[PDB]
Design a protein around this ligand. Structure first.
Ligand SMILES: CC[C@@H]1C(=O)N(C)c2cnc(-c3ccc[nH]3)nc2N1C1CCCC1
Length: 284
């Protein structure tokens, strides 16, 4: 099916569906004037009839469209017609880390380093733009044909705010509540670091350190920041976790500290991961 941008003339061809993405039905979409394929979110205006949800996509678009980095999903273009909003994004043929971890249960340490370095690279870029991601999770780490990771889905993302004027209410329903957010202190860069600690734990163990139901009954455990540290973890992995999930956000490492931790520096990390790793545990 041909889709024409009524503002420009520009023609696109819609391919196969890629699945549901919240407000969006997602599809392959080819720009006919370079012949490049994008992963597109197609959102009917009906799904955004309320002013707040209209503001929600507008914000996502506004923030995403200015980002350009190798480990951030590349925003291509957006337009609207009478029926839909179209957001064309970098096509990532190997799905997400959520799909990979579902298949693998647990990843090897060199793989954890491989993926984490790339997450840190993209997050660094974001934090220097003073943009907070606010929903870092495995499902938002998109993987391309060449096994390269891109951080995406900027649907809870916001610009950084000083504590004195900051939003103190929970924004959306993220995968990993910090202590500070649960203490009504709002979400800072350190809250993304939380969230990375939770990610690393999950990559190595296959389950999160705290419940992810976001039920009020879970709040005390998180805000204590007391959890099980399984013995199966190697010492450096344990130590790095342990710092990222510091109770006081001020005690958590910087992004530069994180990639220079013994967990990264004292182990093998290979330059390129094979696609078999979506599948099968790699060779020693
Ligand atoms: C468009 C939303 C999300 C996404 O944000 N990107 C960048 C993406 C890239 N490639 C793909 C992709 C290429 C081949 C299959 N999916 N998918 C992406 N998704 C999916 C679509 C359905 C749920 C999340």
């Amino acid at each position: 099916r041909i889709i024409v941008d009524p503002t420009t003339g520009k023609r696109y061809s819609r391919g196969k569906t890629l699945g549901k993405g919240g407000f969006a039905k997602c599809y392959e979409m080819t720009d006919l004037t370079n012949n490049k394929v994008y992963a597109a979110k197609i959102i009917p205006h009906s799904r955004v009839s309320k002013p707040h949800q209209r503001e929600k996509i507008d914000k996502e678009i506004e923030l995403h469209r200015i980002l350009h980095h190798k480990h951030v999903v590349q925003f291509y273009h957006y337009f609207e017609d009478k029926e839909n909003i179209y957001i064309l994004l970098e096509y990532c043929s190997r799905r997400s880390m959520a799909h990979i971890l579902k298949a693998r249960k647990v990843l090897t340490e060199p793989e954890v380093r491989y993926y984490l370095r790339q997450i840190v690279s993209g997050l660094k870029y974001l934090h220097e733009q003073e943009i907070l991601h606010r929903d870092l999770k495995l499902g938002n780490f998109f993987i391309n044909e060449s096994m390269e990771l891109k951080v995406g889905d900027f649907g809870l993302a916001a610009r950084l705010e000083p504590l004195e004027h900051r939003r103190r209410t929970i924004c959306g329903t993220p995968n990993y509540l910090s202590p500070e957010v649960l203490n009504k202190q709002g979400h800072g860069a350190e809250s993304d670091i939380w969230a990375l600690g939770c990610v690393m734990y999950t990559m190595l163990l296959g389950r999160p350190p705290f419940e992810t139901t976001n039920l009020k009954e879970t709040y005390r455990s998180i805000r204590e920041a007391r959890y099980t540290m399984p013995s199966s973890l190697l010492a450096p992995a344990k130590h790095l976790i342990a710092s990222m999930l510091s109770k006081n956000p001020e005690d958590r490492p910087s992004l530069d500290d994180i990639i220079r931790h013994d967990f990264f520096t004292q182990g093998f990390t290979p330059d390129r991961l094979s696609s078999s790793c979506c599948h099968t545990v790699p060779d020693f």
